[PDB]
Write a protein that binds this ligand. Sequence first.
Ligand code: I9H
Ligand code: SAM
Ligand code: ZN
Ligand code: ZN
Ligand code: ZN
Length: 425
Amino acid sequence: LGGLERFCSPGKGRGLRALQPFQVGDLLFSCPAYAYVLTVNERGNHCEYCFTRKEGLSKCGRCKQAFYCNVECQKEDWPMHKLECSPMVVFGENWNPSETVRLTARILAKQKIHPERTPSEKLLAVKEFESHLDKLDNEKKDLIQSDIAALHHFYSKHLGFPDNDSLVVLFAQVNCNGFTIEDEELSHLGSAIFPDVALMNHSCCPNVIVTYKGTLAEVRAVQEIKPGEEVFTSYIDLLYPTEDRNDRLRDSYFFTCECQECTTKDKDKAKVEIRKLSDPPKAEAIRDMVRYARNVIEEFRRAKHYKSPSELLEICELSQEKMSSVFEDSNVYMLHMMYQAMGVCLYMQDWEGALQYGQKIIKPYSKHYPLYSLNVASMWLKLGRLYMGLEHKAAGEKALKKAIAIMEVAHGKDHPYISEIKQEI
Ligand SMILES: CCN(C(=O)CO)[C@H]1CN(/C(=N/C#N)Nc2cccc(OC(F)F)c2)N=C1c1ccc(Cl)cc1
Ligand SMILES: C[S@@+](CC[C@H](N)C(=O)[O-])C[C@H]1O[C@@H](n2cnc3c(N)ncnc32)[C@H](O)[C@@H]1O
Ligand SMILES: [Zn+2]
Ligand SMILES: [Zn+2]
Ligand SMILES: [Zn+2]
């Protein structure tokens, strides 16, 4: 952080710039989580305090519903875990606050136990977070109001609250500045507040990548960075075309990107790769597959919440066929559905079927994402593991080596994930 300063970045509020060069692979800084929560689906799998995965975790009393490496991990998490420990017992299987509520409760607790600046806020304090309150529409205000109600409903056994206005602000700050923590395969592990990391502005051709070591955020260069240069990470999945990207950035972060990628649109045609038929369709035919895909995308997002695995894959398939009258297999709308289908296959434990989709995804992914991408790395890593599971030792090795080559840059050469992967080789 000494090699960096915050500054007033025009048209972007505040951001972070470098004073000294950074080579590809260099650590810029790391940031302990100010507040963090492990996602409910990983209970019993990972230590709630440190996120380490173990078979054989120590359980809490009592809730019997939280798990830890050992007595120290448990002791360390108690001030946060107490917010839910006794209230889970009472609510039982009626206990169900969103992850956003769970994290906010933790923020409020941390503000009370530790009001002064933390080591997580060297350049930017939580209380300084941009909220865009002034830009929020009634729709978004509503949603927040709802989270507030749930907060009170589940958490007042052991935490008091500020007034309603102060909380709307905090919720919007959380939406503008919160992070997910994902594993080496980009599975969701949880959600967290990394204030100094949240100083960084977005770009679609980012020069750094944020990765996690348990609950420690680390920030590394994926392009050479000049003195005078703004450090930009990416806030989003970079697979999608410029328009889709910007709908998301406006909707979640209330800005339109104008990075180099977002200005030239050079990657757009290839991401919307067109088939070479002997009667290429009209544009509007394309629209009616694109609008249909973008709509199928949004629609697939909900059935996730409640359809069966047999029934989820069934949907992925028909949508793919229909699209494949106009789109190449390298078209991202095809990739998005192949990815979702893969995830189903991996959940259904269809490993051969998982591998089939992964094999069609990886080359196009390599085209469309930038040179160093966690999405590309995690795909090669899933292919590698799938291959090794089928004792394709050669193909498995090749793919795991490809994941490593990216990860050494993004995660660092000494990251515990690299160690594990090299043991798998
Ligand atoms: C895909 C890249 N991101 C990651 O977090 C990857 O680790 C996005 C995604 N993003 C959020 N997604 C969700 N959900 N953050 C987030 C948004 C709302 C609430 C939240 O925590 C919840 F528990 F409160 C967390 N928040 C991100 C993000 C946020 C800030 C910066 Cl500087 C960079 C990225
Ligand atoms: C986590 S913050 C980054 C710190 C931010 N600059 C601020 O003012 O606090 C997320 C917000 O920063 C701003 N931001 C980040 N990257 C940007 C960019 N390329 N263009 C415009 N604004 C950006 C937006 O106001 C965005 O919603
Ligand atoms: Zn632990
Ligand atoms: Zn407990
Ligand atoms: Zn951009």
